[PDB]
Paper text:
Metazoan PCAF/GCN5 proteins have three conserved domains–N terminal extension region, HAT domain and bromodomain (BRD). The HAT domain of PCAF/GCN5 has a globular structure that contains an acetyl-CoA binding pocket.
The PCAF HAT domain (amino acids 493-658) was purified and crystallized in a unique condition that contained 1.2 M ammonium sulfate and 0.2 M lithium sulfate. To our surprise, we found four HAT domains in one asymmetric unit. The overall structure is similar to the PCAF structure (rmsd of 0.397 for Cα backbone) solved by Marmorstein and his co-workers, except for the loop 1 (L1), which was not defined due to lack of clear electron density (indicated by arrow). We found that the four PCAF HAT domains in one asymmetric unit form two different dimers. The four residues Leu512, Val516, Thr535 and Phe539 from both monomers form a central hydrophobic core, while Gln519 and Asn520 create four pairs of hydrogen bonds. The second dimer of the PCAF HAT domain is mediated through the ß-sheet extension of two antiparallel ß1 strands. The major contacts of this dimer are three hydrogen bonds between amino acids 493-495. While the first interface is significant, however, the second interface may likely be produced during crystal packing due to the smaller size and insignificant score calculated by PISA program.
Author numbering:
A (entry chain A), B (entry chain D): 492 to 502, 507 to 652
Write the structure that this text describes.
Amino acid sequence: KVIEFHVVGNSPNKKILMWLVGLQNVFSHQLPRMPKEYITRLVFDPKHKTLALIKDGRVIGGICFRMFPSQGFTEIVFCAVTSNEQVKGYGTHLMNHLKEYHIKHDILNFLTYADEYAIGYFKKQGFSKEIKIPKTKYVGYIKDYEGATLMGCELNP
Amino acid sequence: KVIEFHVVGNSPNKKILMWLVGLQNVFSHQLPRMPKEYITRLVFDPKHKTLALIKDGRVIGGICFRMFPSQGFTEIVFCAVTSNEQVKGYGTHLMNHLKEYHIKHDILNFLTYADEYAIGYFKKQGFSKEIKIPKTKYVGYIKDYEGATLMGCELNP
Ligand SMILES: CC(C)(COP(=O)(O)OP(=O)(O)OC[C@H]1O[C@@H](n2cnc3c(N)ncnc32)[C@H](O)[C@@H]1OP(=O)(O)O)[C@@H](O)C(=O)NCCC(=O)NCCS
Ligand SMILES: CC(C)(COP(=O)(O)OP(=O)(O)OC[C@H]1O[C@@H](n2cnc3c(N)ncnc32)[C@H](O)[C@@H]1OP(=O)(O)O)[C@@H](O)C(=O)NCCC(=O)NCCS
């Protein structure tokens, strides 16, 4: 009934902090292959911001991303919608809003290492297994993950 | 292999933030009758401290308490051991160490509102149902918890 999108960050007021915990809680529930401590580390890392999906006070989704304005792309880390609220298009809205945030900041590229079970969702948001940014841009900067496949998205206007 | 006891709180240290979150996760998994956001609120509250049990870098247990020096007791909010590690004398250790901390701080009585299933566990730690510290001392200072049983016990030097 009321639904909000906030880019948040630990760079730490009381409200966002509740949201930061809520995001960590949402992520750890969906991403079973991610240890809670690791999520907490990245989520609270000041070089990472998280785009939070609030519904009626409560965090229900988010995308954790790290921007590399120098490389000309953004690494997408932990994106999740809570189980209740899956398949209602929330995840596509988050990616859309993420996409618009970045057009303003003039980063036109997304990179992520995709779980096997969610390659489907990224392909819908325009990601491809075939990457158009040269290796020399992201190798080293971006976290490689075990048996996740790397996908890119090249936004526009 | 390494096992630590730290008394923590929100009174921006990067270590204790991760610990406080790690504590919120453990408290949240183990106590269904308490909503995640409530736990977050109290855990990070500057009048609440928490006894963290770290194991090899990671929180596996804790006791959140609020000290009432002006009263003569300490109120026990949450305590829990992560599930891997239950039935290993870990929570007995935590409570023992909590007792020491408070003796060293001149607060002899512990109060808790105990939930239907851990009455067993508190009873062993000297805890009981009959309080010896006057109702007027704690009522309205402590937080009544619904269909929990109030309990209390004293600790020697
Ligand atoms: C993946 C996820 C973030 C998608 O959010 P969502 O709101 O549930 O999915 P949506 O409602 O936005 O639907 C998105 C589209 O991708 C599709 N899709 C393909 N594979 C999918 C998958 N594995 N999960 C969800 N949607 C998927 C949906 O059917 C939908 O297609 P359509 O609208 O064209 O018909 C969410 O389901 C989730 O939290 N999964 C668990 C954790 C995870 O796998 N994270 C990694 C990637 S974010
Ligand atoms: C109850 C709890 C906090 C204790 O941690 P623990 O390490 O498993 O308990 P211990 O290993 O120290 O065992 C303590 C003694 O109390 C007993 N006990 C009573 N209830 C128990 C319970 N629910 N779980 C484990 N032990 C329990 C044990 O048998 C043990 O007896 P013994 O040493 O004489 O053989 C833990 O199981 C937990 O987190 N439960 C979920 C949430 C909860 O009940 N919190 C209550 C407030 S602390």
